[PDB]
Design a binder for this molecule. Sequence first.
Ligand SMILES: CC(C)=CCC/C(C)=C/CC/C(C)=C/COP(=O)(O)OP(=O)(O)O
Ligand SMILES: [Mg+2]
Length: 339
Amino acid sequence: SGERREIIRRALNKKILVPNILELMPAWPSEFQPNIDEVNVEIDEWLKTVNVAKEKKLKHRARGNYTLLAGIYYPHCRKEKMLALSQFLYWIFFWDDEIDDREGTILCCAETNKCINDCLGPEPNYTPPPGSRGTVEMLYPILRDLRAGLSPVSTMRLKQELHDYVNGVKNQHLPNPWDHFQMRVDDVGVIPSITQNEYAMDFTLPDWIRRHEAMEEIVLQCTKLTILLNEILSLQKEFRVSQLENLCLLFMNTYDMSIEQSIHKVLGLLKDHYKICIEAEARLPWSTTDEKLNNNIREYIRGCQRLATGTACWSYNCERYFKLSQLNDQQELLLDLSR
Ligand SMILES: CC(C)=CCC/C(C)=C/CC/C(C)=C/COP(=O)(O)OP(=O)(O)O
Ligand SMILES: [Mg+2]
């Protein structure tokens, strides 16, 4: 706790100007699905049905605005796609929020895994068991709808990915910053969103391509990029509740560096990972002849990239992490670690 106390003292009241993160990934553009407002209306009507407290749901909706995040993740999807994707994001955020006792966690995760199995499994049952908790009950219709837009191959991937995320959650002095990063890479719930691009754009990437070293690398780099940008962006929010296991903070503690230096390091890491990810593209098994196949490969990688850029763009466009007034019109964010 000496470590934590020192971290708090060093961080506290510091204001750091952060450059536009999107600039760090110049090749990858940020776009918005045209129907976000209309879909939001559907989502608002849908939210009333969901068994989570009205104030919590509104807080998520006003601060989070997950339909917008989905619109950013999948800007080119047909409008009909938007509802299920928006709904899933609401589920994942609600679910994470409710789970945050230990027994409660084991029970919810088991119930959640069961739902994932019932919905995405070989013998599909979309009916929630009676008395399902709200975060569980809501999931069944969403998985059924997503499955409807997915091939069995895409469905299998989604199922494993959802299991992996739920299990990671169940299985969660200061940790080494590198150790923290790796846990997040294994732990993070981004992958289901990448697979969801297949739903959004109604296509299936072949497993042989998905398992290719270059594709596996692009998925990994994009996962790393999303985590790294999240670390900086969420720093103010996390520090304020004294959640000191944030990578910027860990670098301060581990290397005895200033908060400014640690953020700079993370920014450099982003550039490094962006560069690796871009380099990986040449290595992909592009078809000499197949336009549809190459289109599928292109779409799939764009989905991964959007996970990184979109997460940052959405962060710059909602109030989950900081007051928007903290952002200038060059998209430069002034973090304030006043607590
Ligand atoms: C975990 C979660 C809700 C994932 C939803 C899907 C997803 C991968 C969204 C983008 C990445 C992200 C915001 C991760 C959360 O980081 P964090 O766990 O440090 O939480 P923070 O958003 O408060 O920083
Ligand atoms: Mg975070």
